[PDB]
From Swiss-Prot:
Residues annotated as signal peptide: none
Described function: Forms a very stable complex with oxygen. The oxygen dissociation rate is 0.011 sec(-1).
Protein name, UniProt field: Group 1 truncated hemoglobin GlbN
One term under GO cellular component: cytoplasm
Pfam families per UniProt: Bac_globin (PF01152)
Protein family (similarity comment): Belongs to the truncated hemoglobin family. Group I subfamily.
Lineage: Bacteria, Bacillati, Cyanobacteriota, Cyanophyceae, Synechococcales
Listed cofactors: heme
GO biological process, alphabetically ordered: cell redox homeostasis; cellular response to oxidative stress
Organism: Synechocystis sp. (strain ATCC 27184 / PCC 6803 / Kazusa)
Gene expressing this chain: glbN
InterPro entries assigned to the protein according to its UniProt record, in alphabetical order: Globin-like_sf, Globin/Proto, Globin_bac-like_CS, Hemoglobin_trunc, Hemoglobin_trunc_I
Length: 123
């Protein structure tokens, strides 16, 4: 899988997931969501988040996605502030690696698109 070559190696890829994983638990603001959740699923969820940010989709079909995430919005009171916290954490991880600042802005723009936030937030 030479695709990982772009990342700069597979070792670095796992390093980001491992560190990022702890950031979620470290963040008390969203820890309640992960207070009781199977770590197995989290591995995929967190992995998808990083992958989605590096290359999200302008439009995604699937009411099911909104049905679940929206449920959190009304039941747990999830808002854009929560999303920003998770996304902000990702930016910090990139800084540690030393990725040029120019890319950090572009990377955030990928998910920054409100087109993705609406599906998740379902405002
Ligand atoms: C764009 C970002 C996100 C994507 C792409 C995404 C994607 C997914 C996907 C594919 C699932 C189904 C498989 C699974 O259980 O992980 C899922 C489930 C879930 N997501 Fe997300 N998610 C995102 C953001 C969030 C955020 C911000 C929260 C809340 C902080 C969240 C909370 C949940 C919960 C609680 C479930 C479990 C639902 C259940 O099966 O009972 N997700 N997410």
């Amino acid at each position: 899988s030479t695709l990982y070559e772009k990342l700069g190696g597979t070792t670095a890829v796992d390093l980001a997931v491992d560190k990022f994983y702890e950031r979620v638990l470290q963040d008390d603001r969203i820890k309640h969501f992960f207070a009781d959740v199977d770590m197995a699923k989290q591995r995929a969820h967190q992995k998808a988040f990083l992958t989605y940010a590096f290359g999200g989709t302008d439009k995604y079909d699937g009411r099911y996605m909104r049905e679940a995430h929206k449920e959190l919005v009304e039941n747990h009171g999830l808002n854009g502030e929560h999303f920003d916290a998770v996304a902000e954490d990702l930016l910090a991880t990139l800084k540690e690696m030393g990725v040029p600042e120019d890319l950090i802005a572009e990377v955030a723009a990928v998910a920054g698109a409100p087109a993705h936030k609406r599906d998740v937030l379902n405002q």
